[PDB]
């Protein structure tokens, strides 16, 4: 019978080789996720369809930010085959009230607080 899958915890234990490959820092884990759905929920069990709705991933290729906490990660582990998970990067820190309207999320996962639409002078 096809039932829900229990993923062993050994799968989610990063080796030192993995850290070098992906550049993550285990001592400074990223605060937020960037979850994007890249696979259809059709031809998948209903519990995967429901979790996608809970995460706000109804529309594919639409980035969504979620907190890097065990409860949120538990939902991600169920539909990890339908999504792309990337860490959110803040080169200039969190957006402030002054630059709320000048933010953009680049394809590299970086949220830039200034977006001038001009070439760099350097």
């Amino acid at each position: 019978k096809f039932t829900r899958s229990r993923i062993p915890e050994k799968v989610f234990q990063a080796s030192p080789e993995d850290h070098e490959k992906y550049g993550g820092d285990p001592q400074n884990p990223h605060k937020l996720h960037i979850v994007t759905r890249i696979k259809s929920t059709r031809r998948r069990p209903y519990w995967e369809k429901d979790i996608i709705k809970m995460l706000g991933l109804e529309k594919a290729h639409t980035p969504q930010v979620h907190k890097n906490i065990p409860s949120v990660n538990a939902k991600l582990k169920v539909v990890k085959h339908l999504i792309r998970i990337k860490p959110l990067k803040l080169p200039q820190g969190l957006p402030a009230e002054e630059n709320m309207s000048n933010t953009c999320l680049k394809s590299t996962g970086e949220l830039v607080v200034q977006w001038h639409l001009k070439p760099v002078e350097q």
Binding site: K1, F2, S5, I7, P8, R44, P45, E48, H81
Partner: protein
């Protein structure tokens, strides 16, 4: 056979993908495939599978 599994240069193995439910592959696999690891299909045994 143990040597073949040790020096296997393929980054992807049946055991790793099936146990981790990668790609949702367990929707087309069997619960016995968690322990057979792709070496057995029905009554048939495939010695070349690693």
């Amino acid at each position: 056979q143990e040597e073949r599994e040790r020096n296997n240069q393929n980054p992807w193995t049946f055991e790793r993908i099936a146990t981790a439910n990668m790609l949702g592959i367990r929707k087309v696999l069997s619960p016995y495939d968690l322990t057979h690891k792709g070496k057995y299909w029905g009554k048939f045994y495939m010695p070349k599978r690693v």
